[PDB]
Every structure is written in structure tokens, then in C-alpha cells.
């Protein structure tokens, strides 16, 4: 479970529940389950907060990876309804946690910030500089390889 949150991949709350609910909440003689996620009311509150953490981690992963994901797809991947996912995303956006722009009319959750011409051409120039530099490295090493294999 700890290594799961360190991996930059979506974890499905349904699958995570199906694989960890008995081990964490219920437990057994061989698995001394803690009181953190017990059947108590505070246990259920902590369970809801765990689901919130899971969906926040998933949302961060999508923001890292996706650019324009449909709202229904995000709802399916977050194990939430469309309205619940929309409300959670709006809450995250307002608190400046993540950057998103919910195009509600079409159901688009575009993540990338607007690309000004300045930054676009700056990225183009950076790509060109890297290309030239590693071309120079390749030329030097090609000279080395020819030189050794006389």
C-alpha cells in the first residue's frame, strides 16, 4: 500500500478496496488490523479521507500525464460519479492544488496551461540548442570511434 502511492500510475479505488478492505478494516488473527479504519464513525471518516487521498493522487497523476481527458473518463477512473468528480475537481482548482479548466459544455478537463507564443518559441529554441549540443557530442565521439578503429 505504501509503495502504491509512490508509483506514478492511477490506482483504482474499486480494486484497492477489493484488495485491502478485509486486511485494513476487518483484519484477522494473522493480521492485527489497526483502529484507523475500523467500523467506528471516526473510522468511516478516515476511510472517506483515504478515498479522498486516493482520488487526489490519481488526479495528480492525470494532471502529470493527460492533457485533455473527458469528464466521463475521469469519473470512471476516479470511481466517482460525474457530478462528484466535477465538484472534487472544482474544489481542488479553487484551492490552487492543481491546474485545470473544466469545459463543462463539452465535458473536457483540459490540463495544460495556455501556450503563449513566447514560451512555445522558447521551447523550440531549447530543443534546437539541445539538438546542436548532442550533435556536437556525437561528432566528438564519432571522431573518437574512427580514431581508435584505425
Amino acid at each position: 500500500l505504501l509503495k502504491l502511492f509512490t508509483t506514478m500510475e492511477l490506482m483504482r479505488w474499486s480494486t484497492l478496496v477489493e484488495d485491502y478492505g478485509m486486511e485494513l478494516r476487518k483484519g484477522s488473527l494473522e493480521s492485527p488490523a489497526t483502529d484507523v479504519f475500523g467500523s467506528t464513525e471516526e473510522g468511516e471518516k478516515r476511510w472517506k479521507d483515504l478515498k479522498n487521498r486516493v482520488v487526489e493522487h490519481n488526479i495528480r497523476i492525470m494532471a502529470k500525464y493527460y492533457t485533455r481527458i473527458t469528464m466521463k473518463r475521469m469519473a470512471q477512473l476516479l470511481d466517482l460519479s460525474v457530478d462528484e468528480s466535477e465538484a472534487f475537481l472544482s474544489n481542488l482548482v479553487v484551492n490552487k492544488t492543481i491546474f485545470a479548466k473544466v469545459d463543462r459544455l463539452a465535458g473536457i478537463i483540459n490540463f495544460q496551461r495556455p501556450k503563449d507564443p513566447n514560451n512555445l518559441l522558447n521551447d523550440w529554441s531549447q530543443k534546437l540548442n539541445s539538438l546542436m549540443s548532442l550533435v556536437n557530442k556525437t561528432t566528438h565521439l564519432i571522431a573518437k570511434e574512427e580514431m581508435i578503429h584505425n
Binding site: 507564443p117 513566447n118 514560451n119 518559441l121 522558447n122 523550440w124 529554441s125 534546437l128 540548442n129 539538438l131 546542436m132 549540443s133 556536437n136
Partner: protein
Amino acid sequence: EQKMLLNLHKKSWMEGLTLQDYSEHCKHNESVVKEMLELAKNYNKAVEEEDDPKRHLEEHVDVLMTSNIVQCLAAMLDTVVFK
């Protein structure tokens, strides 16, 4: 020895085709054009009250023209060369 002392400050070939930071070029253009605006005000006042804004204006124009022309030409060369 003359040429291989010249090799000291000689710019690399990647420097000729490199492009100045576009976000910096715009700020430089803004600054120099605003100075040119103040210079144009001074030049209008001086020429009207005649019957050194001119030199400063000419220097600013030289700077602006060389910077923008070089950046544009480097952009075109980079667009054609790398495809």
C-alpha cells in the same frame, strides 16, 4: 600562432544558430522602444525649439534593428535547417 590565438575568443558554430531568449527579446524591445518614445518627445521639443536626442535616437535604432534582424534571420535559418 595568430590563428590559434584567435581560437581563444572564437564563438562556437552552435552560437551563430542559437536564438536569444524570446521572453527576454520582447522585454528588451519594450524597454528600448519606450526609451525611443522619450527620445522622440525630446527630439520634437528640440527641433521645434530650433529656429542630444538625435544621436541617442540613432543609437537606439541601430540596437533595435540589429537585434530584431539578427533574431528574425536566425529564426528563419533554424526553421529551414531543422525539419
